[PDB]
């Protein structure tokens, strides 16, 4: 790792930017995503933010899904998580 | 009776100037023999010397046999409080002679009065300059 003389700033390695700060990447990108949380029962289509801040509910039993924390929302053990993307 | 030990309490108080050997009841409200290092010397500088404590310990050993005091609980202490806390020079000899003068020793503890946070120590902010 002599210095950037060996790497190319234009085409940097695709995994080293998976670890840098989002602002400090070559092009700024969010670190979050949106996920459609599926409860144990029906009504499995609700969409929630990864770094959510509001305690979302469900139409059935209000089925508390996530708790807001300092980072990613604390999903419950009973709620299944899969992610939706662009 | 014999063998089974009757216990007194020796409140050794060894400062840098004197050395008190004070034998009391378990309560501490009584007193068997109280002799300082200054009684056994003719100069008020040698009171804290180990040999003065040696003599005083010999005398306490002689006194504490006639009343049946066959063992001692030693509570060694120093000036304590806001002043110096290490025991004085005569703290050890006074103990050692107790061992040598046919006297039994029970538990040994240190009861130097330590403050959680004391008043102002004397000498001033610059300290005792020599």
């Amino acid at each position: 790792m002599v210095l950037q003389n060996d790497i190319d700033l234009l085409n940097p390695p695709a995994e080293l930017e998976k670890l840098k700060h989002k602002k400090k990447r070559l092009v700024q990108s969010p670190n979050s995503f949106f996920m459609d949380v599926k409860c144990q029962g029906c009504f499995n289509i609700t969409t929630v933010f990864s770094h959510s801040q509001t305690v979302v509910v469900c139409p059935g039993c209000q089925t508390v899904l996530c708790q807001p924390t300092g980072g990613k929302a604390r999903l419950t053990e009973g709620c299944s998580f899969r992610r939706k993307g662009d | 009776r014999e063998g089974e030990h009757v216990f007194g309490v020796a409140h050794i108080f060894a400062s840098f100037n004197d050395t008190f050997i004070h034998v009391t009841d378990l309560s501490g409200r009584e007193t068997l023999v109280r002799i300082t290092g200054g009684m056994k010397v003719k100069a008020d500088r040698d009171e804290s010397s180990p040999y003065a404590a040696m003599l005083a310990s010999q005398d306490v050993a002689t006194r504490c046999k006639e009343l049946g005091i066959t063992a001692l609980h030693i509570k060694l202490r120093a000036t304590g409080g806001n002043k110096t806390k290490t025991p004085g020079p005569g703290a050890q000899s006074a103990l050692r002679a107790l061992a040598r003068s046919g006297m039994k020793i029970g538990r040994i503890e240190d009861v130097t009065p330590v403050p959680t946070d004391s008043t102002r120590r004397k000498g001033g902010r610059r300290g005792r300059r020599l």
């Binding site: - | 009841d25 378990l26 309560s27 068997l32 023999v33 538990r107 503890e109 009861v111 330590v114």
Partner: protein, 213 residues
């Protein structure tokens, strides 16, 4: 030390194993110096190693109180339980967190007493961190747990059971294992107990915890 005075013998409470505790003096009868009133020394420091004949508990200290002088004996009772300076000075180590708690719980016998607990954080078996500290927001929860466990095991029947759970480490172990969800908390037990107030002599309840002498 005089040709006067009387050699009395103390009697530790029945709760311990050995009742004989040294000997004591008093003025015989001279004038207004009554022997019965003069023997209300009411304080005796013992190690609890002698009262149990086991040497590993020498760090403890028991403060007994002379309640009634009868039959050439003194018939003491519990008045406090403290620590020697050796153990306390040995425990406090650098690169460690010291947690101290205290409560003013009350028993059924109206024996107002104050209890103190002391605890220290424990390093894990695989620990490279050289400090093993805790955050104040955690030591506060530890202190709350200490206080609630103290008031839980207390606020119950007479002090007999309270000292029955003092010579062993029942409060200390319970606090130790009720806080492992926060920190390991090694070396937890009651530092000292201070009797804030005694109800009265009550004239007889003392004989319920003493043998036939």
């Amino acid at each position: 030390p005089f040709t006067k005075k009387q050699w009395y013998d103390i009697k530790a409470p029945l709760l311990f194993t050995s009742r004989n505790v040294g000997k004591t003096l008093v003025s015989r009868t001279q004038g207004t110096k009554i022997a019965s009133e003069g023997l209300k020394h009411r304080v005796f420091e013992v190690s609890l190693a002698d009262l149990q004949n086991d040497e590993d508990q020498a760090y403890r200290k028991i403060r007994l109180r002379a309640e009634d002088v009868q039959g050439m004996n003194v018939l003491t009772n519990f008045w406090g339980m403290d620590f020697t300076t050796d153990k306390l000075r040995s425990l406090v180590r650098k690169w460690q967190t010291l947690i101290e708690a205290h409560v003013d719980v009350k028993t059924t016998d109206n024996y107002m007493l104050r209890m103190f607990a002391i605890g220290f954080t424990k390093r894990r078996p695989n620990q490279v961190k050289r400090t093993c500290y805790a955050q104040a927001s955690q030591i506060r929860q530890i202190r709350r747990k200490m206080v609630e466990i103290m008031v839980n095991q207390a606020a119950s029947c007479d002090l007999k059971e309270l000292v029955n759970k003092f010579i062993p480490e029942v409060i200390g172990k319970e606090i130790e294992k009720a806080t492992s969800s926060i920190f390991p908390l090694q070396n937890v037990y009651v530092r000292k107990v201070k009797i804030l107030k005694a109800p009265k002599f009550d004239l007889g309840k003392l004989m319920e915890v003493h043998g036939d002498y």
